[PDB]
Design a protein around this nucleic acid. Sequence first.
DNA 1: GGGAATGTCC
DNA 2: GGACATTCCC
DNA 3: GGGAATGTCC
DNA 4: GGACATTCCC
Lengths: 312, 312
Amino acid sequence: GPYLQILEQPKQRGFRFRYVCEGPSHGGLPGASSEKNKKSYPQVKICNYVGPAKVIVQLVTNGKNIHLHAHSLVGKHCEDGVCTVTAGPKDMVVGFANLGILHVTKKKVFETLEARMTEACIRGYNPGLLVHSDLAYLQAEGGGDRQLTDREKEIIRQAAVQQTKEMDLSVVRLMFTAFLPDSTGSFTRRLEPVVSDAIYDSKAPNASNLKIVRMDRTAGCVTGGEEIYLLCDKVQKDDIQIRFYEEEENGGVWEGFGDFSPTDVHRQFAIVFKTPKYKDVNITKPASVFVQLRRKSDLETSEPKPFLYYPE
Amino acid sequence: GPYLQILEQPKQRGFRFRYVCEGPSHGGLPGASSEKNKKSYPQVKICNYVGPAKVIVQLVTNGKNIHLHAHSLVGKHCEDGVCTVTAGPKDMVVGFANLGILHVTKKKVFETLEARMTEACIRGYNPGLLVHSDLAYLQAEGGGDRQLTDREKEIIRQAAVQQTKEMDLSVVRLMFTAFLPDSTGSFTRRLEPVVSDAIYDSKAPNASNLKIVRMDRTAGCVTGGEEIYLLCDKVQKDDIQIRFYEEEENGGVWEGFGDFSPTDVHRQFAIVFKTPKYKDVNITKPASVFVQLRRKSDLETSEPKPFLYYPE
DNA sequence: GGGAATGTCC
DNA sequence: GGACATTCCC
DNA sequence: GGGAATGTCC
DNA sequence: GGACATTCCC
């Protein structure tokens, strides 16, 4: 039958979440294949159906139990953290440019989360699959402002207080639910939602852009063991490592690692390390390698900086 | 006439203000003579009176006025940010062990300040000195029964807005107010309040003690102009200099300055600078000097480090 | 984006 | 007490 | 918020 | 030695 697919995933990394105090106008969420010269944005497509329809986007959590997220989508076609776009009559590909992710503060998570649940229990933005599987009246179609019961209050409150402690504010996922026209019911044919790849906040320490601001020494002996002070952007003492490497024309690249313990990482912004030994202790002319920061957890690197090895 | 006297003042520096999240048991405010083994506490005494008396302690601002402070007092006999002790009926000296200072969130200064300034006008806590000079309705002592008008509550609001904007969350002062029994039996006779010395939050960036953690080069030539990388603790870029001092004959401390712009302060934790030229460039023996961090604002220093000036 | 003040956690 | 994550500000 | 380190009673 | 404050110090 008819279904909804993700044509272009959102870019997992390199985008920064913004707080309410940071305002908007900090750029739109880019697509997985976006570039500076040719910009690209997340895109879905309605399959096995043509004609008018609507697609709603909303942030969900990242764990196994897909739950609502306290952050919000902001920008064009965005209200109350939910982005709604009408799918064209001819073109079924729905793009989402100028999208923004509003980073809600830790304090405001619970009240924001409990609000989203009470909104989805009335609007019908997938009530059971997100709030809790205990709410019975997953029936939606609208029903107007609907109604509230003093049992649903307890259910919503407990779901919110539970999902608050289970929520990571550094990673969100887009969820696209498509709605097709009904028997003059405007739009209420709920297609199964499609969760996108996890989006990681650029401001998070384990996802920020690695960079080597400067280095104490740019040349050292092949025997290694040379103490160097490296000034860098924010790193995590237990997660960072310093890699020298050279790309051999043979095919296999050589890599060594500067030696340091988490104690040598000074206040997340500098590293004192001893250099490794070059693979050729008995070299004739100086060899030219590069050095870079690398995160153990996800192997992200930094712009390499040159380095020279000398004979004895 | 009976008065109140501060026997031992609170130690002005070294004590760190704590937030609610940091919990209790992070130490009480030590007296000025307390030490690592002999631990004293802030203590006062009601002179020219003997009998049951009630002493209260509040936090007040350090500015050109004595306004109520948004921070709170916590610990034994502390409730609602106010400390209350009962001295007597024979001993009129009373100390305050386990008396910590709770740092209020910036986002809760106004509502806290306004709530306390309104309580000061209802019972006449010198509202012309603690709240606003316009509210000079000193209904002190036997007050407690006054409903504020719609104009006085607006003076309280504007004072709360203004004092919030000018409140220094890094310095507080203890105010001790003594109460003696009246003709009935309960404590009503309010003696002169006494303001203590100013307590300075050690955690403030404008008062955190400087420290040189590491240096890449422990020596340098006398000609100066050598690039040295220095790892330090949290310092402010526009308010830091590196001083090489030599204590020679009859004092005469030779001072050289490390050359660096504020942009060379790497993220408040590192300085890349150039050594100055030594006093006598023509020496022939390594001349031991010391190097330290100096805060151009108040000229406080760190623990110095040795640094040898070798000739050529 | 880059940087720091502010609040949190150990 | 030391170190860091979080939030704010430019 | 962990470790250590006392000082209780048991 | 165990439980249980109580404190001190990162």
